[PDB]
Symmetry: C3
Subunit: 67 residues, 3 copies
Amino acid sequence: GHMKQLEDKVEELLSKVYHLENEVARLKKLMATKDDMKQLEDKVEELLSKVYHLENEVARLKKLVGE
Amino acid sequence: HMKQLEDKVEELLSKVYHLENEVARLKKLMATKDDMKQLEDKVEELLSKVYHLENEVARLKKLV
Amino acid sequence: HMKQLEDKVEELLSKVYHLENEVARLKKLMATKDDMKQLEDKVEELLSKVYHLENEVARLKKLV
Ligand SMILES: [Ca+2]
Ligand SMILES: [Cl-]
């Protein structure tokens, strides 16, 4: 009947909540964070400048070795 | 029996409230694929510049 | 009292459907620990190769 329908709906939801809990637990354990990324970004900012300076230094040497 | 059903529904609502809070915390904290790809691209661009510098330096070394 | 229970069940169903869709979205967007580890290792490669080139360039300059 009507109580039976409501029980059956709540069974469906019980299962859905169980699965959502499992999925969220997983995302939390697998998540790389914004902060982790910013830490690498900061290192890449350093290296960007270093590679540019190296390019300028190698260009100067090439020209020198050129005469 | 209705009480026990009403109790189960309130237990499930409580778990859903906690999940909503957890999801919002995830969204706040998570790095995303697009931004990781942007950074990885920049690293690869730099790695390619370095590989080319390595070859130029080698060549210069053989010239001297 | 059945109406009270029906309305709580409606709150639950609606909130669960919303969460399902949000969790699906986040699964597609969220970069992982493993992804970050691989990018950390690429940046290690880059910083190590930069340092070696810095040394090789300083040496070559002294030689010239
Ligand atoms: Ca490593
Ligand atoms: Cl470094």
